[PDB]
Every structure is written in C-alpha cells, then in structure tokens.
Amino acid sequence: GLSRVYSKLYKEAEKIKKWKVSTEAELRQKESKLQENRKIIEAQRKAIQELQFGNEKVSLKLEEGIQENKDLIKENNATRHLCNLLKETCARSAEKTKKYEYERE
Amino acid sequence: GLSRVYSKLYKEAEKIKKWKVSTEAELRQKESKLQENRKIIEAQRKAIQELQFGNEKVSLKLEEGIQENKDLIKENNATRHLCNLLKETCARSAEKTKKYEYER
Amino acid sequence: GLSRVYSKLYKEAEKIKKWKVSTEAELRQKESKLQENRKIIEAQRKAIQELQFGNEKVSLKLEEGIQENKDLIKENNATRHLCNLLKETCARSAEKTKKYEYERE
Amino acid sequence: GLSRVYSKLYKEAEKIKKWKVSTEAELRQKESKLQENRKIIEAQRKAIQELQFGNEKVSLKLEEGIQENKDLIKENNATRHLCNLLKETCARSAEKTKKYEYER
Ligand SMILES: [Cl-]
Ligand SMILES: [Cl-]
Ligand SMILES: [Cl-]
Ligand SMILES: [Cl-]
C-alpha cells in the first residue's frame, strides 16, 4: 500500500535525474558548437578580406592594360594616316621631277 | 499539518515544472543562435567561391591583354619603319626638285 | 505523471492520520475503562468484607441458640426422670400408710 | 544522491511499520487487562450473591430456634411444677409414716 507509492516515487526521481543529465549534456554540446562556429566565421571574414584585396590588385592591372592597348591602336591608326599623306607628297614631287628630267633633255 | 503536506507537494511540483520550462527555453535559444550561425557561414562560403572565380576570370583576361599588347607593339614598330622610309624619300625628292627649279 | 504520484502520496498521508486518531481514541477509551473497573473491584471487596462480618455474627448467634436448646431438652428429660422416681416413692409410702390406718382400727 | 532517496524512503516506511506494531501491541495488552478485570468482577459478583443468600438462610434458622426455645421453656416450667407437687406429697407422706411407726 505505502511501498508501491514509495517505489513509484523513487522511479519518478530516476526519470528526473536522467532528464537533468540529458538536458545538461545537450546544452553544453550546443555551447561548444557555438564557440566553434564563431571561430569559423572569423576565419572566413579574414579570407574574404584578402580575396577582395587581391581582386582589386588584378582588376587595376587589367584596366591599365586595356587603356594602354587602346592607345597603341590609336597611335598606329595615326601613323598609318601620316604614311598615306607622305605618299601623296611623293606622288606630286615625283611628277614634277619627271617633267624636269624630260624637259632638260 | 495535513494542508502542509498538500502545500509542500504542490510547491515542489510547481518548482519542477518551472525548472523544465526554463531548460527547454534555453535550449531553443541556443538552437536559434546555431541556425543564424549556419546561415552566415553558408553565405560567406558562397562569397568566397564567387571571389575565387572572379579572381580567375580577371587573371585570364589580363593574360589575353598582355599578349595583345605584344602584337600591337610589333605592328606599331613596322608602321614606324615604313613611315621613316617615306619621310626620307620625301625629303630627298623635295631637295632634288628645288635644285632643278634653280637651274631653270 | 508526477502529480498522480503526489496525489496518491497525499492520500496515504490521510489514511495514516485517520489510523493515528482512531488508535489513540481507542487506547484512551481502554485506559478509562481500566480505571473504572478498578474502582468497581475495590467497592466489591469492601462489600464482601462486610458480608463476611455479618455472616460471622449471625452464625455465632445460631450456634449459641442450638446449644441452649439442646440443654433445655436435656434438663427436661432429667426432670421427667426425677418425677417418675418420686412417683415410686409415693407408691411405697402410700402402701404403708394404708396398712397402718387399717391395722389401728 | 539517488541511493539517498532509496535509503530515506526505506527507513521512513520501516519507522511507520514499527509504529503500527507498537500501537497494536499496546492495544492487545490493555485488552488482556480488561479481560482479567471482567473475570474478577464476575467472580466477586457471584460471591456477593452467595453471601447474601447464606445470610438469609442463617437468619431464618435463627428465628426457628428462638421459637423452639420459647416452647422448651414452657415445657420445662410445667415439668418443674409437677415435680414440686410430687416432692410435697413425698415429704408429707414420709412424715406421716414416721409418726405411725412411732405410735406402734
Ligand atoms: Cl598603307
Ligand atoms: Cl588616310
Ligand atoms: Cl410422666
Ligand atoms: Cl424414668
């Protein structure tokens, strides 16, 4: 009569201890995972920082090269134009030279 | 005496329930923190991948430009040489004309 | 789960209080009956003492009367015997008296 | 900690059982005392009845004896009176005889 009540009372005590041990373990496991993930987050931030720095370097070099190549195309076109002008000058000069050569004979 | 028994049993069971609620609350709080962290970590992993991929592309385009620059230098050199030849022909031809015109 | 255990625990407490109150009442009731019966026993002892004293008185009076009556029967028998002797004496005397009366005539 | 719970529950239930046994023992002890008393009280009640009945009988026999004593006194008185009459007749007759014998 009274022993069955104490027996069930002891069992509830057992269940409470188990629930306490389990929840404490789970809480510590979550806390340890939080501290791990915060170290990972900081490592990733530093990795991103260095990658953004490298991207800036190479992007600047690319833009400088693009502009330098645009200038070379411009200069070459201009020298080609000058070549064509000099050919015109040669043509008129050569024509006069031939006239004088023939006339003096 | 007997209401004491009733009262102490009531308060003990109430304390146990309170203790259960508080523990489950703290568990759900830490779990939400873990979820937020996992979302940040994933977003940063993506950003890292895209930065690595972008660095690669820009490097490749830089190599292409360096090669184009070489070819353009060769082209400008050849056009300069032709230009100088034409300049010499012009000057020599102009002085010849001036001489012929003086004589006549 | 835990409330049913505490409820049954409270009930066992109720049963224990009732058992305590009942057994205490019964014990006091028995003690009060003991004290009553001891007063009765002493009263009866004194009643018996006086009855034995009265019996002795009346028994003595009875025995004295019995003996006194036995003596009266004895005395009466003896006086009857003496009467018969005196009658014998009268008979012999009267016989002689008659002789003398007749002879002197 | 947990064996503490087991131990305290065990000792408490043991104390309760002890307390129950002691109470029932004291009850049976007082009950046996009440039985002994009821047997003494009954025996004394019987003795009282028999003493009252005996007193009555002896008183009645005493009354009978007193009456017998009266009748015996009357009888002795009558026998004495007759005895005295006979004594007178004897004495008177004896002196007469003595006189007659002197004369003759
Ligand atoms: Cl050309
Ligand atoms: Cl042109
Ligand atoms: Cl007679
Ligand atoms: Cl006789």
Whether the Cβ atoms of residue C97 and residue D93 lie closer than 8 Å to each other: yes
Closest by Cβ to C2, choosing from B1, B5, B16:
B16
3-state secondary structure of D94: helix
List CB contacts of A78: < 8 A, sequence separation 6 or more.
none
Distance (Å) from CA D5 to ligand 4 centroid: 114
Q: How far is the CA of B89 from the centre of ligand 1 (A)?
A: 16
Residues of D whose CB is below 8 A from A10: 5-6, 9
Resolution for this PDB entry, in angstroms: 2.1
Rg (CA), chain D: 45
Instruction: Determine the Cα–Cα distance for residues C43 and B95; give it in Å rounded to an integer.
Output: 184
> Residue D104: in which H helix or E strand, if any?
none
How far apart, in whole angstroms, are the C-alpha atoms of residue A87 and residue C88? 239
Instruction: Flag if A97 and B100 touch (Cβ within 8 Å).
Output: yes
Yes or no: say if C54 and D53 are a contact pair by the CB < 8 Å rule. Answer: no
DSSP reduced 3-state for B104 = coil
CA B88 – CA B81 distance, rounded (Å): 11
Distance CA D41, CA D10 (A): 47
Q: Which tokens go with C89? A: 């004496």
Strand segments (E) across chain C = none
Distance (Å, rounded) from C-alpha A36 to C-alpha A34?
A: 5
Cα angle B85, B89, B92; round to 5: 135
- Between vectors from CA B44 to CA B40 and to CA B45, what angle results, nearest 5°? 115
Residue D2 makes CB contacts below 8 A (sequence gap 6+) with A13, A14, A17
Q: Which residues are CB-neighbours of B51 under 8 A, at least 6 positions away?
A: A48, A51, A52, A55
Report helix, strand or coil for C105: coil
Q: Calculate how close chain C gets to A25, using CA atoms only, in Å.
A: 23
Q: How was this structure determined?
A: X-ray
